[model samples]
Structure formats: C-alpha cells, structure tokens
Target chain A: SPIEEQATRLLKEVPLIDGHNDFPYMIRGWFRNDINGQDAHLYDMPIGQTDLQRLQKGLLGGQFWSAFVPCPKNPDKEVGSLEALRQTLQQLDVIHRLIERHPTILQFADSAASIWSSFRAGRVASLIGIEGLHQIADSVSALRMLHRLGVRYVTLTHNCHNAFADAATVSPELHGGLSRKGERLIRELNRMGMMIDLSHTSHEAQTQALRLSRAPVIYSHSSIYSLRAHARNVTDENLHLLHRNRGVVMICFLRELLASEADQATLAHVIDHIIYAGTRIGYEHVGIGSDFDGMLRGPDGLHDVSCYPALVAGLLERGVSEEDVKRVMGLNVIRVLEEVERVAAELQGAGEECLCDELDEVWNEDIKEQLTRERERVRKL
Target chain B: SPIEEQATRLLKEVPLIDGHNDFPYMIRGWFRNDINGQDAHLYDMPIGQTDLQRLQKGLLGGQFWSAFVPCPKNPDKEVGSLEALRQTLQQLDVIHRLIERHPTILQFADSAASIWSSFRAGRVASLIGIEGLHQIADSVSALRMLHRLGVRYVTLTHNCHNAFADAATVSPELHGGLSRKGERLIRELNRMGMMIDLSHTSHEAQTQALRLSRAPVIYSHSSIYSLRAHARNVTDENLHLLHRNRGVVMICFLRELLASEADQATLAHVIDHIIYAGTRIGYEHVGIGSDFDGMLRGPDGLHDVSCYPALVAGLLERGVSEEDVKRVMGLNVIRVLEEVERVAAELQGAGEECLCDELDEVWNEDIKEQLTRERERVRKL
Candidate 1:
C-alpha cells in the first residue's frame, strides 16, 4: 500500500515520460489509415494494448509516439527503400492528425520544455520518433525533414541491416558495426539535435555510436542482455559505454528481454532490469521504455498500457530510493533530450559545417571561367 | 542619363526581388557543393549567369534562388522521385550555406517582413523556391517540410508530368490538369502559406490551380504566350484568370520564350513580353522572373545578373511609368507573398481543419469502452 501511494505521489510530482510506444503503427496496421467516421470505435479500440482511455489510465505525462513502418520488402531494394520513405510520411501524417484531433488528450511536443508545459496543462505530450535508418530512404535530407516534423529520435536499425548500421536480430553483421558513413552521420545527428536511438541496433553498433556521438544518445527501448541474454537487449559492455556517453538506457518491458522464457516475465522482472542498469550506470542513466503494442503481449504483470503504476510501485518495493525511482521514471530521459538540444545549439553556434550528401560535379573550370569573363565585362561597364 | 537615374533611384526605393535563379543548382553542378577553398572561383563563376560579384553589380535587392534538379531520369519511377527529393535537399543545403557564408551580400527571407528587414539592412533578401513537385517526391508532408526549410513556392511541374499536375513539355498529360489530389492540395498550400508556382505546369493545370487556390499564386518564371509560342509560356486565357485570382505573372527571360530563335532574343524582347503582360493584366499582376541560368545563354543585352540595371533602364526608356516600373521590379511579387500569409492567418484563425492524409482505424467500440471503464476505475482509486 505504501509503495503504491509513493508511486502515485511520484507520478504526480514528475510526469511518467515513456521513451517509445508503437500505438501509431498499431493504428496504421488496423485502420489502414482510415480513421474517418470511426473516432468513437477507434478510441475504444478492442484489439490493441493501447487506447486513449488506457493511455490516460496509465498516467503517462509524455510519450514518444512511434512513426514506424516495416522494413522495405520489395524485391527491388531501391523501390523498397523509396516506398518506406513514403510510408514513413503516412505514419507521421496520422500521428500529427491524431494529436491535432484529440488536443484535449494529447498535446504535441518537440522539446523538454514543451513536455513540461504539456504535462502542466494536463495533457500527454505526444512526441515523435522513427524506428530505423531504413525509414529515411537513404537520404540525410529526408532525415532532416523528419526532425523538422518533430521526430525527436531515430532508431538506427529496425530488424534488418541498412546503410547506416546493423540490427541486432539480423544475420551476418554488416560493416562489422557502423560504416564510414554511419560514423560521419553521428556528427550530423548531434549537430541537428536529433537523438540517436540505439534500440534495435547491434551491440557493436551501439558501442560505436556511443563513442562516436558528440551528444548523449538513447536506447529508447532495450533491456539488459546480461540479465536475459537476448539479441534485443543491451550487453554489459555497451551499457558501460552508455554511461561514459552520458546516455540513457530506458529499460524495456518486452517479456523475452526480461526472462529466459517470455511467459515467466512480470512487472518485477522489468524492475530488475531497471535496477541492474541503474545500480551499475547510476540512476541518472536509466529510464522507462515500455515498448507497448510493439509486441503481441507484454510481461505478465505488465500486460498493457494501464500497468505503468504497477511497474513504478514494484521499483519502489525493491528498495529503490524515491529520487532514483523518479529519475528512472522520467528525469533521465528529459536530461538526455535537454543535453541533445544543448549540444546542437553549441555546434550550430560554432558555425560547424553540416554533413552534405555525396554529390556529382556538374560544372567544370572552363564553364566557370566563361561565366566569370561575361560578369567581368558587365562589371567594367 | 535621366531615365537611368530614375531606374537607379527606384531600385534603391524598393527591393528588386527576382522570382527564380538557378545559381545554387549551378554551384551544385560545378563544385558538387564543395564551396570550401573555392569561394573566389564561385563568386566569379565562369559558366553560369550568376556570381556574387555580378549579383552585387546588378544592384539586385532580393531573389528566390531556384533549388532546381533535373527531372527523374531513373527507369524506376520510385527511385527517380526519391532521388529528386534528396537532390532537392542538397540544393537547399547549399543555398542556406551560401546565404549564411555571405551575410553581407545575401540574407535568408521567408516572410514579407523578413524581406524588408533584409533590404533595410542592405543585404540581398535571398528566398528559396523548388523547381518542381518532383522535388517533393509526392508527399505533402515532405512539401510542408520544405516550406519549413524556407521554400516559399513550389513549381507544379517541371518538364515531366507528376501525380498532381501535367507538364507543358511532356506528352500524354497525366492528369490533363490538376488531379483530384492536386485540387485538394491547393487548400493545404494556401493554409500553410506556401505560394504555388504555375510556371512549368500545362495551361490546363495552371488554370485549374489558379481557379482553386485561395491565395494569390505566381508564375515564378514563365513568358507571355501571346508574344512568343512556347509550351513553357502562359496562355492569354490563363493570364486573364490570373488577373481575376489577383496573382502575379512573373515574366521569364529565357531566349526561346522571348523569340522564335533563341539567339535572336535581347533585353528589348524581354521588356516587350513584360509590357504585354502589364498592358493585358495590369502592372499589379506583372513582375520580373529572369529564369537566369535556366539556360546556357541569356538574351543579348541581359547576358548575366549584372545586366539587371540595363533592363530596368531599358523599361524606363520604353516609357513605362516609374511607379509601374517599381511594381514590376519587386513590389508585385512581395504583395502576393504578403497576401498568401494573410490568407493563411485568416483561414487558420477560422479554425479550418487541416488536410490530413487518408488513414484507417485500428480500434473497436468494445475495447474502447473497456479502456474507459478501466480509466474510471483507476481514477476512483
């Protein structure tokens, strides 16, 4: 009873900010993006773990709503990649509309300040994140555009390898970790204030990104591999590197990442992973990433979006300090976002050159000189 | 000398905002956007009509630098479109860098207010416009992102038909004019304050857009079809429609659009087209759009950007009143932009629903009711 009361008090004091949720993608899968004339039915969605009512019941002050599309499946890689880009846009469109249409429930936020403002105004601060580099369709420009659209973080890989990095679940490792372009993109990401999400990326890739990124990165939804030994979880080595990088590993609630058998996992298991990371990396380096609706079912005690309080209470029951619990709930992630913004402003203020795409030369010296001569004649007049 | 004096005085009074110039694309072509250690060569470019030295010599006050990329040439339409979007970003990046690097010569402007501020600061008010819808890759979301990145106008088509509209030079008109989607997009464009450019669209498309758009549009660079017969020029019927729509027809200076033979064109021919539009549609609906570097060579007396003064003096020598000359030089286009912003504010103030992409639903009534009950239970506790 005391733990439950403490959890409730903490939630009220500091918003329970979630690192990632796949509710937007769920909307895409079931609705095919046709929400018209179905608002009533949609909000009462019978089929998913997430809904407006359950979201509110969970007492979530903020959520990074995922704008995810599946990996390109077309036989033609080029066509597949481009299709992903278009589909990514569709997902973003729906998320924006969802927030706009239900302003009473969800207020759009792109920064730490906005999150706090939305929380103060009693609304879920709906932020955006794309799942993978594949979603960018191999264009840094498109990635920048995604940032402009309020996408705060981008998971480096989804379930397959892309030009940027390798996914954990995929086969033979690509680039051994991050390629040359991947390394260079880290600077660009830091410069643009876009959070580099290490979730779904290989441990090697995470290590590389952690070292390369100028700003603190985020593992939006990942658990401890040393605790459960899953591909989707974070290894101890990378976890330490995350500490050095001043990043947050928002422990995930996926059952497989919690226990040897997914069915054996519970709300307590989720807390164990959080405690393990916090104990090793410090409370400031850990936070919550429920990964709701990303899987068919969550852990035993965390079956749906309405169970966040149980997880928080479980953490307090395990002798975690109230301050550490609050940091685990939201503060760490907020710090990461603030630091990302700070790094971007610092770099931009220094007039750092942005990373440009590989381009082909269209002009020759001869052509340039001819134009110069013509302009010289005009100047003489 | 007295006419020249009047023309110079008029240039100082109001900004001479050119609708389109391909200098950024030129930088892309010649240097591959590698402006490092090449600033001197770029300022005195040998092949293109624009260079910083000549730009200053021209006494130009403002410009909408064209972020032009060639029509998708890839056999795979999907790849081509995506490639075009990426190239558009590269062009945009360079344009921004160019402006930032030469703050003394060029300053970025997005609003009418910003334009005057830059002019008062004695800097070229550099605005951005993409050449074709192809640059957007058929995503309205991406189009909005471009607007956020400071793109003020989007040419409906270039030399190829896109999903929304038909191109003048392309055969087998895709939509004949604006498609159902195109008609709907006009509302979104106006709501977002993005000025529509009908320069490269088919006459049918231009007419449809002109009729549907709530705000004044622009022919960023198109000539008078009455004076010269070219698919790229505006028709009389559309010109009259433009007048009714309260839009501007920014006359182009491409030699082919001015005369039957490109070599036979001159600054006098450019003025003739400008006069034709002014006389037919009133000076309020006529503005200068040089379309410089859209071709390899310019009209005889207006071979480069520095030749702007000569054209202004020539318009005066041709008995155009000073007020009309000032309007043609820049005021007309500025008014169109101001009107676009005003229309957007008025519509937004009225709480007009934004045009959202078609999406499907993922939720049902039974589940929603359960969630609502759950929320109620949680709140009671």
Candidate 2:
C-alpha cells in the first residue's frame, strides 16, 4: 500500500513522460485523419488502446506523439519516399490540431521548460517525434524543418534501411552501420538540438550513433535484449554504449520485446526490463516508452493507456527507490532534452558552422554577374 | 510636401500589407539560409534590396515574405517538385528564425488582428506565402499543413505547369487551366481559409480559380496585361473576374511587366500600372506587391525596400484620394483576409466537413477484427 502511495506521489511530484505513442497514426487509420465533428468519439475512442479519457486516467504527464507513416513501397523509391514525407506532415498536422483543439486535456510541449509548464497546468504535454529518417525523403533541409515543426526526436530507421542508417530487421546490412551521410547528420542533429532515436536501428547503427552524437541520444521505444533476445531490443553492448553516451533507453511495453511469449507478458515483465536497464546502467539512463496504439494488445495489467499508474506501482513494488522511480518516469528524459538544448547553445555560441544542404546553383554566370554589378550600385549609394 | 506628409501619415495609420516579396529566397541565394553569425550583414544585407535598417526606413507596415523556390528543373518533374517542397520548408524555417531572433524588428502575423497588433508594437508584421502549388508537391494535405505553418497564401503556379494549374509563361496549356484536382483543391483551400494566390498562373487558370473560390483570392504579385501585354501580367478578362470574386490585384514592380523594355521602366510606370488597375477595378481592388529582391534591378527611383515611401508619396501626388490610398496601402488586403476567416468560421460552424486526403486502408479485415476484439476486452473490464 505504501509503495502504491509512493508511486502516486512520484507521478504527481514529477512528470511521467512517455517516449512514444502512435495514437496519431491510429487516427490516420480509423478516422482517416479527419476529426471534424468527432470530438466525443475521439475522446472516447472505440477501437484503440488510447483515448483522451483513458490517457488522463493513465496520469500520463507527457507524451511524444509519433508522426509515423509506413515506409514507401512504391517501385519508384523516389516517389514513395517523398510520399512518406507528405504523410508525415499530415500526421503532424493532426497531432498539432488535436492538442490545439483540446487545450484543457493536452498542451503542446517542444522544450524541457514547456514540459514542466504543461504539467503544472494540469495537462498532458504533447510532444512530437517522427518514426524514421525515411520520412524526411533524404533531405536534411526537410529534417531541420521537421525539427522546427516540434519534432523533438527522429528514429533513424523503422523497419527498412535508409540512406541514413540501417534497421535491425532489414537484411544484408546496408552500410553495415552508419553511412557517411548518417555520420554527418549526427553532428547536424546535435547542432540543431534534435534527439537521436535508435529504437528500430541496427545494433551496429546504434553503436555508431551512440559514439558519434555530441548530445544525449534516446532509444525511444526499445526493451532489453539480454532479457528477451529480440532484434528490436537493445543488446548489452548497445546498452553500455548508451550509458557512455549518457542517453536514456526508454523501456518499451510491446509484449514481444518484453517476454519470450507475448501472452505471458505482464506488468511485472515490463518492470523487469526497466529494472535490468536501470541497475545495469544508472537510473538516470532509463525511462518508460509505452508504444501504446502501435500494437493491437498490451501487456496484461497494462492493457491500455489507462494502466500507467499500475506500471509505476509495479516498479515501486519491485524495490526501485522513489528517486530512481522518478528518474525512470520522466526526469531522466527531461535532463537529456535539457542537455541537448545546452549542447546546441554551446555549439551555436561557439560559432560552429551548421550543416547546410548541397543546393544546385540556380543563377547562371551572366545573371550572377549582373547581380554583382547591381549590388555594387547599392553599395555606392 | 503636404501631400507627401499625408502619404506617410496614412501609411503609418493603416498596415501597408504587401502581398508578396521574395526576401526569403534572397536570403537563400546570398546566405544559403545560414544566418548564424551574419546578423550584421542580415540586417544590412550586401546583395538583396531588403535589409532590416532599410525596411524600417521604408515605413512598411506588413509583408507576406515569399518562400519561393524555382520550378523543379530536375528533368524528373516528380523529384523537382518534391525538392521544391523541401526547399520551401527551408525558406520557411529561416523566415521564422529571422522573425524570432529579431523580435524588435519583426513579429509574425497570420491574421488581420495580429498584423495590427504587430504594427502597434512598432514591429514589421511578418507573414508567409508559398510561391506555387508546386511547393506543396501536389498534396492538399501538405498545403493545409503549410497553412498551419503560417503560410497564408499559395500561388497556383510559378513558371511551370503543375497538376493543379497552368503557368502564365508556359505554353501548350497543360490541363487547359485548372484541372479537376485543381477545382477540388480550390474548395479545400476555401474551407481551410487559406488565401488563394493567382499570380504566375495562366489566364485560363486564373479565370477558373476566380469562379471556383468561395473566398476572396489575391494576385500576390502581377501587373496589368492591358498596359504591357506580358504573359506574366493579368489580362482584362481575368481582372474583371477578379473583381467579381472580390479579390485584390497586388500590382507587381517587375520591370518587364511594367514596360516593353526593363531599362525603360520607372517608378512612374509602376504607378501608371497601379492607377490603370485602380481606375478600372476601383481602389478597393488594387494593392502593392513589390516583388522586391525577386528582380536583379528595380525601377529608377524605386531601387530598394526604402523606396516604398516614394511610391506612396507618388500615389498621393497623382490625385489619389486619401481613402483610396489607404485602401491600396493595406486595408483592402486585411479586409480580404478577415473575410476569409469569417467564411471559414461560418462553414465550420455549419458542420462542414474538412477536405480529408484519400488514404489507403492500412488495416485489413483480420487486423481490424482483432482490434475490435481487444477493445471489447478492455470495455468488459
């Protein structure tokens, strides 16, 4: 009972930030991304693990609502990739509109400061993350714009290999690890204060990113591989690398990643994964990532968004200290985000050059020369 | 001198909202969209006709900064179109950063009220517009997202024919004007409250859009075809339609559009084009769209942003009434935007369904049935 009371206190005292949720994509699938005149149904969704009422019942302090679309399947990879980019925008638009229209229940958060402010305002701090670099269509310019559009984290790969990085489930090991562009993008990601998400990336890719990123990275929704041996889970080597990188591995609740058999998965199994990471690394390097609505079913006793409190209580009952529980809940992720901002400010303040896209010269030499001559006239004036 | 004083007085009293200016593209060209340590140069740009110091000297009230990218020329129209969308975001990002970093000099405005508030605060009310539908990559969803990102208007075409509309300079008349998709997009645009921009579009395209748009539209920047007979200018037939649609023709300062030879064009010629439109369509339908920095050189007296006072003074000196001059300065455009908002509110209030993108079903019958079963389980609990 005391542990249950402690879990409630910790949740109330500090924010319970969840790393990833696919409710927006769920909206895309069921409602066709059209929430017009569906407020009542939206708040009480009929066929998802998440809904506004259940989300509040869960006491979720914050969430990184995923702006995810499936990887391009068109034979024209170019068109498919670009189509994904457009779909990414649509999901983002709906997430933003969702927060804006439901200001009382969900407040938009893009910074560490805003997260706390929203919590104090008695609202879930709705943040944004893109599921894959494929959504950017190979354009760092578009990636930067996604960051501007409130996307705080970008998972490097989903289930397919991209120009940036390789996915864990993809075969043949494209690039073996981070490509030259991926390595270069790490610096840009750090410079721009975007958190690198290594959830679905290959172990080699994760190692490369962990070694390369100047700012703290995140495994937004992954479990412990040492416990479950899943390809989507983080291995011991990557966990150590994440520790050195000072990043948080937000433990995922996807049953496949948590237990050998998904139906056997329970809240206890989730706490075991969380405790494994927290004890192996430090408490500061562990957090929760529900992946709610990304799956058809959740772990037993944690079947929907409304079951987060049971998760907090389960961890406490497992003898995780209150401070450690708090860190795993939200503080650690907040610290990572704060450090990302600090690194960006320090780098920007140092006048370090930012990475720019390679653009083709549009002005011809004759036109360029004319521009020079005309500029001279202005200088003379 | 008294007339000059009255022009300045009227300019200060009402927001002189210019519909289009490609200053963001100028930043892209000269600085490559990296203004990190170039604050000194950015405020007093070395290459473009616009700079912060001169902007203040011009006594300009508001400006819809053009996020213009050249038409896709990648041989692969799809690649080019998609690339343009990314570049558009880059421009948008820089424009937002510019306004955010220089709060004293610029404040972002999306509505008429915001414009007046920014003007009252003694800051230039900065707004955003995309140069073409090409910038949207043929996605109406993307266009709505652009609207959410502060893009208030979208020119139907730039210099190349797109799926939605035909360009003025491009012959062979692709789609013969607005295509079926373009007609549907017009209704979506109106429903979303985004101001339609007809500049750079073919005469036929403009006619179709003017008839189709339920909300008022604008020629972000174009001149009168009756005066110069340029393909890039608006024809009399479209001008009458523009009047019927209750849209404003924001007269352009492109020398070629104003005179047979660019070198022969002057401030008097620009005012002559303005007067022709004003005398024909009434003053309420004419506004300024300087297209500054979009051209390599400007008319003799109006060589840069600081020369706007001269244009205003010239209009007053040409026997333009105080009321008409005020309307041309900014009131007319503001009224159009207000009407756009009012129309959107009315439609939404009447439970009008928003334009939703046609999305492929991501879930099959089996997966959806599983989801339904899972929801029933939760409900039973």
Candidate 3:
C-alpha cells in the first residue's frame, strides 16, 4: 500500500473535489426525483454507477452534483423551454433533497469556504451545477435565480446548442463560438460569481469563453483534444487560453474523450489527460471531473467513484509531486471556486450591472382594479 | 419641381427599399392583423403613414414592411417565446395579405430579382422582415419558416435584449456583442441568404456581426452617431466596418435618432445622416430607411412614406450626384440583396450545411402500436 497509503493521506489532507457527477440524473431516472424513504436504495443501488455506500468508499471530499435536465424536446419551443426549466427545478430539488437526507455522508457547499467546512465536518461537500444553458429557459432572470438556488456553476451547452453557446458534437455549429447572448451571459456568470463550466460545449466556444470570462472557468467534464481528437475534448489552443485565464481543464473519465476507441480507455488514459493538461497548463489548473453516473460505465480502473484513489496513487507512482497530487485531486478546483467568488465579489463591489431579465409589471392597474372589484363581489358571496 | 422631378426620376430608376416601416404593426394595432375587407382603410387610411394611394404618391419602389412584435413580456419565457413566434406569423400573414390584395399597386418580393420585377411592373416591391430574434421563439425552425414565408431580413433586436443579440436601448446589454447562438444564427442567416439587419442592435454587436457575417449587412433604419449622439445611431467605427463589409448604412428618419431635440428633426436632418454615411462609407453604401408610421408623427418634413420623395430631393439638393442619389434612394439596398443572394447561392453550391433545429422522434412504437390496435376496434364503430 506504499502508493495507496500516500494517496489516501493526500486525499484526506486535501479534499478531492471532482468537477462533475450526474447522480441526480440517475436518481431522477430511477426514483423520479423522489428519495422519500429510499435511503436503503440510495446506499445500495440496484443498478447504476453511483450509490451513497460507494460514494463513502471513494472518499470524495466534494462534488459538483449535476442538475441535468434533457434538452427542449417538445415541438413547441416555448413549452420545451419552460419544460426544461421545470425539470431543472425538479433535478435541483432532488439534489438538495439527496444531500439533506444523507446528512451523515453529504453536506451542501456552495463555495471553497463551505467545502472546507463540510470536509472538516466529515461529510462530502455537495455543490450543485446545471449541465446546460437550456436549463434556464433563455432567461437571465432564471439563471440568476438558479444561482440564488445554490447552483455554483452552469455548463454552457450539454449535447445541443442553446441560445447562448454551441455543443461540440452538433455539426456545423449554430454559433461559431459564443453567440452575443452567450457572451453577455458569460459576463453575468462572472459578475454573479458562478463558475463557468466549459464541458459539452464546442472547442471554439471554450476558447472564446476562456478569454471572455473575468473569472476562471472550468471544463467540468472534458479531456485533452490533442490526445483523443474528440469534439468534446479541449484543444491545445484552449488549454493555453485556459491557462492564461487561470482556469482549469478538469480531466474527464469519458471513454471516447480519453481514447479513440472508448472500450480501450482506462484509468491510465484519464491520468494521461490530466498529465497532459497539468504538464502544459500547470497542475494547479488541472482537476479530476469524473462524470460518474452520467454514463452506463466509465474507463477501466476508473469504473466507479471508488476508483479515485487508484488515480491518486497512480499519479504519485508516476513521480508527481505530493503538493501537485493534492491540487489535481481537489485543491485546484477549490482555488477556482475561491477565485470565482473573489472575482464576483470584486465585480459586485464595483457595482457592475447584473444582466436582468425583462419583468413587466405583473398586472396592469385596470387588471388590478378589475381583480379588486371581483374580490369585493366574492367577499359578499 | 426643381428637386421633385430629379427625386421622382431617381426613385423610378432604382427601387427604393426603405429599411424599416411598421405598417404591419399598424395594421396589427388597428385591424388586429386582419386586413380583410379593409382595402378602403389601407388605401385611404384613417391613421398610419402607409397607404396604397400615398405609397404611389411617394414613388416608393420597394419597402421592408416591419413585422414588428413587442418584446417577450410574459413571466414565463417559454410562453413568451412561442407567443412571439405566433405573433410573427400573424404579422407576416397580414403583410402578405396586404401585398396580395393590392396586386396592381403592391407585389411581394423576397429577392433582388423579385424586387426589380415588382418595380418594373410599376408596383411597390414589398419585402418582409421580423424586428427581433425573439420573434423566432428560440427555434431556428421558426426563423427558417419565417424566411420561407418571405421574411427577407431580421433585425437582431427590437427594444429588448434577446438570446442572440442586445438591443441598443436595453440597459446593461445582454451578450457583450453576439452570444454563441447569436453568432451561430449569423452563419445560418448568411447561409440562408437572409439579409442581416443591424438596426436596433448594440454597437459591439454591429462590429462583431459586421466582421463575422460573410455577406454585406445593412443598418435597415439607423443614423450616424457622430451626427446625433443617440444609442440607436451607428458609430463611426461601425460605419468604417460597414464600408469594409460593403454594406449599406440605410439612414433612419426617426426624429430622436436624427436630432437631440426630436421636434427639430427634418428632411434635411435625414439627408445629413445620408450624406454622413455616403461621404464616409461611399455613396454605394447609403440608402433611406425612413421609419415612417413607426411613430405617431415624423420629423418636420419627412412625415410619412409619401415624404420619401422629399428625402430623395433633399439628398440631390445637398450636392449629391444623380447616380449617388439613386444609389442612396435604392440601388445600394438592391445591391445588398443581390449580393446576399449571390453569397448564399455560392455557399449552398459549395455544400455548406444549414443550421437545423432539433426534431425528436414524434412517437414511440408503443404509442404507434396502441393507435394501430385501437384503429381496428374503432373501424367497427
């Protein structure tokens, strides 16, 4: 246990904060966003990548539990948009409920400060993030409200383009990079102190957003493009930009992003992605973002959340510095969260205008007057 | 008739495609987008700047009738978006109906060739354009459908910020310039041969889009900022970009945009804008976009659609060459439309992929099978 002991010690000393995990989606699919009297099922899942028992076994310090909702599927775009919003709330609701229900294992954290507090209290720091901009239904007001509702980060795109950004997998991207609204939302995201997640977005979008964001951004669950040549992976240009922006390219465990043939992917491939980013951008700008439960399976040796220690142990075995190991583990993400908060505070303190949603007066005077007249009649009835 | 004869001849030589006129919205407000049996009102209107009789009097050969809808005002963004799309269809419906009903006086045109056909046929070449991206309701499908329905150009925004671009008057502009999706839409717009109208968009949006759009863009109804310091007016930097893009800066006759004291605005002020753009961007990149009928009253002399002749005569009197006057009168806009079509055909011929909206599988096998099974039972009934 030479490397194992060192990795375990390092993880305990510096909390491992993964950039992404989609357990909420798993719970949503199985339990329908309801976890009432289902602690047993949560701890010992029938079938899925994540369960609370395995979560504890992995010894994860913090997580950005994905508040993912599917893309607008309805033919009527408006209904689809609003439906996504409603689903987002439901997903968010379950994430909070999951954390609250599992008090012994999970404690919600929104900042670096809270992460430490939760870690110190011997609980996993469960932070929230929506997987796509579509979740907000194209309303900055909804996005702000999402921030207020404990969403720490927002992934610009999932697998499809929203009004803001583009998805990597989608061909002939709608926006070349970030649309005008996407650029504006980036400012609001920075000003509001929300950590900008670059996962599931196009390479151009990632690069454009990297330079545009005032706060350091995160590739919540993306890998190195140079190694895999996957659309979802980060390009070297983007890696350079991410470094310049003081952002992180948290290595994803997705097989296809890590390997040309997904089946050939392994823990070593993930380590290679991390090493590539860490070597080029610096270890301080690299972190693990296990897209746990987002897929049916993960790369070999990184099969589940429990396999994190193997990654940490493997890094140590590969002659990575003990300090850098902790950073790649979670310290880097904590720093990003701290910096994001700092950037937001500074912007807010400077009185930077926040992007506001159009909120027309709910009811006109005539409508109110009619309501009042109707209310008076109802009172007699 | 010193300038009048020259103005009439200039207009006759070139089809004057006035950038923006809100007569569709006028019909919407007065007749509720239902112009059926309203020919008397349309020709000799009780209110509004547009009328078939007056249109003939103005010697206007072409017009981009504004399918202007109010910004998404609903609390529910989804509902608001779809509602905008529906309203867009309604406005488009009336504009077509208006054109079709008065076939002798007006003719619908979506291309430069069509515009000339209508003009040569001695009819007003009516063009259609939606006022904002919000009109598409977060769906590229609707935007394309609108284009097919004869929406020749689309103003990026009306008076509010949208998913694509920011409005000039909207505070703390959403999307610094163009959001990722906004940028994507530009590609599609260019690909689809839709004229990209820069009117009502923020300065940064104009600059970003001007550089991004392959085809020449037009400021359908915007004035020079150096001449009048209004947010709606175009900056010199944008004018320079417009020149570089070989696009037209169709001068707006909006009183507020024309002068600091809106009441003091006149036909001369409109020509001052035209001359400013003409001198700076070249005569080939200048045109009149009198925002007639958009407001209750226009500037002192350029009062309505009929007053376009005065604007043309004013440009001629201001030492403008006959050819330049004709260019500003309409040739420049015609050139933009022709160029737009040319670029689209080239791109399409080059096998450029058009931006597509997501259309999920309509029904599952279970639903289809169930329907089939139920149909057998229903046949007996």
Best by TM-score: 1
Instruction: Assign candidate 3 its CAPRI class.
Output: incorrect
Tens-place lDDT digits, model 3, residues A309-356: 889999988888999998898988899999999998898677665564
Interface RMSD of each: 4.7, 2.3, 19.0
Off by over 4 Å in 1: A1-6, A34-38, A361-381, B1-9, B100-104, B172-175, B316-319, B345-381
TM-score of chain B of each: 0.95, 0.96, 0.93
Of the true contacts between chains A and B, what fraction does model 2 have?
0.55
lDDT of 1 by residue, B1-381 (tens): 887788788888999999999988878877778675677986777567898988998899999999999999998787999878778867887888788778889999998999999999999999999988888887886776678778999998899888888999989888889899889889989998999999989989988898888999999999999889999999999999999999999888898899998889989898998899899899999998999888777888888888888888999999888899999999999999999999999987786766655543444767556555654543444
Model 3: per-residue Cα lDDT over B89-176, one tens digit each: 5567567657755789989888888999999999988999888898876766456556656888999998999989999998897789
Model 1: per-residue lDDT, tens digit, A5-120?
88888888898999989988877766666565667856777555788888888888899999998898889898888878878877887887788768999999999999999999
Q: How many pairs of residues collide in model 2?
A: 0
Encode model 2's per-residue lDDT on A1-381: one tens digit a residue: 877687778778999999999999988888888888889988898899999999898888999999999989999888898878888988988898788678999999999999999999999999999999999988877887788789999999999999989999989898998999999999989988999999999999998898888999999999999899988999999999999999999989899998878899999889989999988898999999999998988998989999988999998788888889889999999999999999998986776766767766666668667777887897787
**Candidate 1: deviation at residue B91, Å?**
2.7
Ranking by lDDT: 2, 1, 3
lDDT by residue (tens digit), candidate 2, B268-304: 9989988999999999999999999888888888898
Q: After superposition, how far is residue B355 of candidate 2 from its true place, in Å?
A: 0.9
